[PDB]
Amino acid sequence: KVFGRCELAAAMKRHGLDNYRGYSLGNWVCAAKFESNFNTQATNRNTDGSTDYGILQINSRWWCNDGRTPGSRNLCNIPCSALLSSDITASVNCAKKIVSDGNGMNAWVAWRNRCKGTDVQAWIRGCRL
Ligand SMILES: [Cl-]
Ligand SMILES: [Cl-]
Ligand SMILES: [Cl-]
Ligand SMILES: [Cl-]
Ligand SMILES: [Cl-]
Numbered sequence: 001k002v003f004g005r006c007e008l009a010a011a012m013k014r015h016g017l018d019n020y021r022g023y024s025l026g027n028w029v030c031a032a033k034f035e036s037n038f039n040t041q042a043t044n045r046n047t048d049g050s051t052d053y054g055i056l057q058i059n060s061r062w063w064c065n066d067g068r069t070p071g072s073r074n075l076c077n078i079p080c081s082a083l084l085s086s087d088i089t090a091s092v093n094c095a096k097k098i099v100s101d102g103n104g105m106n107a108w109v110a111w112r113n114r115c116k117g118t119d120v121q122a123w124i125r126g127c128r129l
C-alpha cells in the first residue's frame, strides 16, 4: 500500500506514535517519507547482507527475522514480512521499541540526515487529525 501523507499521519496517530518518546507526528511522517516514500512494501538490501523492511525500513540485523541475516537478532519478535503489511500495526509496535533503544529517532539515518532539525510540522500541515 502506498499511503497519502495525511492518510499515514492519521494511521500513525491511531496506533499511538504521535508524540511517542517525544517525537511529534511530523517526525514520523517525515521518516516514513524518506525511508519508504510511504510504500508499505519497500525492501532494501544492506551491504552487510541485512535487509530493511517496510514503511520505516526496519533492519533484519536487529529487529525482525528474515532467515537470511547471519547472526542477527529479532528483537521485535516478528517475521520481517509482517513489516510489509498494508496495516501498519507491526511496523509501529517495532518502531516503538527502536526509538526506545537509547538514540531516539537517530536509529533512522534518513531521519537524522533529512528530517532532524527541519520544519517537520509541514508533513502534517492541513491534515484533519
Ligand atoms: Cl508527500
Ligand atoms: Cl509535527
Ligand atoms: Cl536470520
Ligand atoms: Cl519468523
Ligand atoms: Cl493501518
Ligand SMILES: [Cl-]
Pocket: 021, 022, 103, 104, 105
Ligand atoms: Cl530522544
Ligand SMILES: [Cl-]
Pocket: 006, 126, 127, 128, 129
Ligand atoms: Cl486530511
